[PDB]
Design a protein around this nucleic acid. Structure first.
Lengths: 424, 19, 55, 218
DNA sequence: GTTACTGTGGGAAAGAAA
DNA sequence: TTTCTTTCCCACAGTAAC
């Protein structure tokens, strides 16, 4: 078997030009309902696993160009619950660019306070890809429909985070429809679900775009605005209200908690409400207000359930052709600080899953690296002469791209870019 | 309160209602 | 400068020695880990191809 | 800039006879730079001329933070020797000076800060105390000092990871030893109910595992 | 139609934390 | 006793296969 190769100098330049990064991705609700006995309360919304990136295709072509069927180059993958002794349900990624596990569930046997979705992955010809995980997920025995104190967060949605809202008709898992967007409007496809920003707007808010949001958690009554975390299109000013027994209340200052059925009040008009007509999202009114001037009974299909979704992400590249070892784990870089400067210019990185078999690349230049720990690394900023055969001191600001490169070739595109600034 | 998130509005049915 | 330079030489050396020990300790277990991983990949690829036949 | 070009590269006493100006890119003050480029002399005059020694750059780091990250023993002493200087300053990510001193493996800088009475149990925006990083970086020397000077040996970061855990994960035999010597609890499951012996058995660090099974028990 | 089932949601029951 | 959180229970109501 061809021994691993050090990503050659020329190899980098090639990537920097193309940059067809193969990137996995995952989306899931930060919380999950634990099923007791032999029950089975699936994960809603269903954990999706997109496979964005142009490199994904370039891999298909490269694989077949060496003898691979439409089946031997088709990326396969399973999904499971951390270190649980259950079976990793498979995924059907044929033709599709994603895939949701509409049947993932956790039993009460797993006495874990937390856990995280495990996604085994490999190509058609058993070519190992790696194991991609998702952020942690808290286990709840039941959504505290009772009051919520702003002391125990994590269960309280905050202005800015992402969330998901679905609908359950007549108590049937086959009906469940999630709030989605496509074509330019807000659907309700029970096949797809999307994360929607939930900014908090002060009662004295204007019309729409170019507005201002303010930090803080969200309690029923506040004028919140839901923006599509992808397309961008959002629904006009809305006011969330705590609901129960098909009745949308107007007097509820309680803080919105995870898994809490609630109705959304449109703009400052008379009544109306956001409801799902078993097809798409259309306007309504919910005029019945006989009970109390503060208890406006609302027609079903408008009592969406709240949930805060997260998002895991991993991007890499086969900078030096296939590799005997998996591209997992994936080194992520969150912080990049400069230590000192000049003759001793050094860089300290901090992220996750860092490995001792890594090296940082300043553009097309490989700089010495020191492995601190799983989330810290020290490299040496190469002299500017390594980018300007003519100078010995920064004559002009030169911005080179940063990137992590393993020893077998696999390169992990960061996003950060170190820039050489003239020493004052 | 110092930040600012832009977007793209979209109204289903009965938009003039808000007046 | 020769007094402080020494402080620098010693620091970088220690950092480099650390990396050397970690990388070597990682590569040493590489086989044990890599083989055990592929062993799991096999068990699944078997069900992935077998679940394709029942289609 | 004028007072920043002669304090980073009687060039400080003649101009001062601008002070706390932050650049657009680094957003650091003359003091920061004078601390990063380890310009002891310049840094001193900057403080004498009454200059805020706790201003934060574009990343939340103070002149002291740069003193450690740049291992500027000189400027360092000058800062920790100043009453005003905040020793428990925190970057935007919760990174404290004491922590950086145990990360970039610097000479003594840690105990110096600890002696100047700096919160030893300070935690970053992740929960990792200074003793934690000392375990992940297998910095025994620093680990011992942080311990002798009272430090929550069983403190848990946000992920409920104990100092011993990170030592077991990273495979820090030397530090794992020390921690265990000081009767550190080894049965502290993280947020995922995993003992330091498990993560170690996973990384296949047989050494650490051997300790967690026979070293200083009962 | 008939049977055998099954996620779901609301409520009763048992602990465990005030 | 109060106040929740954790476990059990059970019945709508669609699915699937005859």
């Amino acid at each position: 078997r061809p021994p691993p190769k050090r990503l050659t100098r020329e190899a980098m330049r090639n990537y920097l030009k193309e940059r067809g990064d193969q990137t996995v991705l995952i989306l899931h609700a930060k919380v999950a309902q634990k099923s007791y006995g032999n029950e089975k309360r699936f994960f809603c919304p269903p954990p999706c696993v997109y496979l964005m990136g142009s490199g994904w295709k370039k891999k298909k072509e490269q694989m077949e160009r060496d003898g691979c069927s439409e089946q031997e180059s088709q990326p396969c993958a399973f999904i499971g619950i951390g270190n649980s002794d259950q079976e990793m349900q498979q995924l059907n990624l044929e033709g599709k660019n994603y895939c949701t596990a509409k049947t993932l569930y956790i039993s009460d046997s797993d006495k874990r306070k937390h856990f995280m979705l495990s996604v085994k992955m490999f190509y058609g010809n058993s070519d190992d890809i790696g194991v991609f995980l998702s952020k942690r997920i808290k286990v709840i025995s039941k959504p505290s429909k009772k009051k919520q104190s702003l002391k125990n967060a994590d269960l309280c949605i905050a202005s800015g985070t992402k969330v998901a809202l679905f609908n359950r008709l007549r108590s049937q898992t086959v009906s469940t429809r999630y709030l989605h967007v496509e074509g330019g409007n807000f659907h309700a496809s029970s096949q797809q679900w999307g994360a929607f920003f939930i900014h908090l707007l002060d009662d004295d808010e204007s019309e729409g775009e170019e507005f201002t949001v303010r930090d803080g958690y969200i309690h029923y009554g506040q004028t919140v605005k839901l923006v599509c975390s992808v397309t961008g299109m959002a629904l006009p000013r809305l006011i969330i209200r705590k609901v129960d027994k098909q009745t949308a209340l107007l007097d509820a200052d309680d803080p919105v908690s995870q898994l809490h059925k609630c109705a959304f009040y449109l703009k400052d008009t008379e009544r109306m409400y956001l409801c799902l007509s078993q097809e798409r999202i259309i306007q309504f009114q919910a005029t019945p207000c006989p009970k109390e001037p503060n208890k406006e009974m609302i027609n079903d299909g408008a009592s969406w359930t709240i949930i805060s979704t997260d998002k895991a992400e991993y991007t890499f590249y086969e900078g030096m052709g296939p590799v005997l070892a998996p591209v997992t784990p994936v080194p992520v870089v969150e912080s990049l600080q400069l230590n000192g400067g000049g003759d001793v210019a050094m860089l300290e990185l901090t992220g996750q899953n860092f490995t001792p078999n890594l090296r940082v690349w300043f553009g097309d230049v490989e700089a010495e690296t020191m492995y601190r720990c799983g989330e810290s690394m020290l490299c040496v900023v190469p002299d500017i002469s390594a980018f300007r055969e003519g100078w010995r001191w920064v004559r002009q600001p030169v911005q080179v791209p940063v990137t992590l490169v393993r020893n077998d070739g696999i390169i992990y595109s960061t996003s950060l870019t170190f820039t050489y600034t003239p020493e004052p | 309160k110092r930040r600012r998130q832009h977007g793209q509005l979209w109204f289903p049915e009965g938009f003039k209602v808000s007046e | 400068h020769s007094a402080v330079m020494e402080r620098l030489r010693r620091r970088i050396e220690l950092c480099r020695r650390h990396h050397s020990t970690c990388e070597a300790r990682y590569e040493a277990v590489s086989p044990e880990r890599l083989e055990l991983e592929r062993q799991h990949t096999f068990a699944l690829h078997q069900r992935c191809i077998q679940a394709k036949a029942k289609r | 800039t004028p007072l920043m070009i002669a304090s980073c590269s009687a060039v400080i006493s003649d101009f001062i006879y601008s002070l706390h100006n932050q650049t657009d890119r680094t957003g650091e003050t003359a003091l920061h730079l004078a601390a990063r480029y380890s310009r002891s002399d310049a840094a001193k005059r900057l403080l004498e001329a009454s200059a805020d020694a706790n201003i934060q750059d574009n990343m939340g780091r103070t002149p002291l933070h740069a003193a450690v990250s740049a291992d500027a023993q000189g400027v360092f002493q000058i800062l920790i020797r100043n009453r005003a200087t905040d020793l428990d300053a925190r970057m935007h990510d919760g990174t404290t000076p004491l922590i950086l001193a145990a990360r970039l493996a610097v000479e003594g800088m840690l105990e110096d800060l600890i002696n100047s009475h700096a919160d030893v149990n300070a935690v970053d925006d992740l929960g990792k105390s200074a003793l934690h990083w000392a375990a992940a970086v297998n910095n025994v020397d620093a680990a011992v000092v942080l311990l002798k000077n009272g430090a929550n040996k069983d403190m848990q970061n946000n992920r409920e990871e104990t100092p011993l855990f990170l030592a077991a994960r990273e495979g820090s035999y030397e530090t794992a030893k020390v921690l265990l010597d000081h009767f550190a609890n080894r049965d502290i499951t993280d947020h995922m109910d995993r003992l330091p012996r498990d993560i170690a058995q996973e990384r296949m660090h047989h050494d650490i595992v051997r300790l967690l099974d026979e070293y200083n028990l009962v």
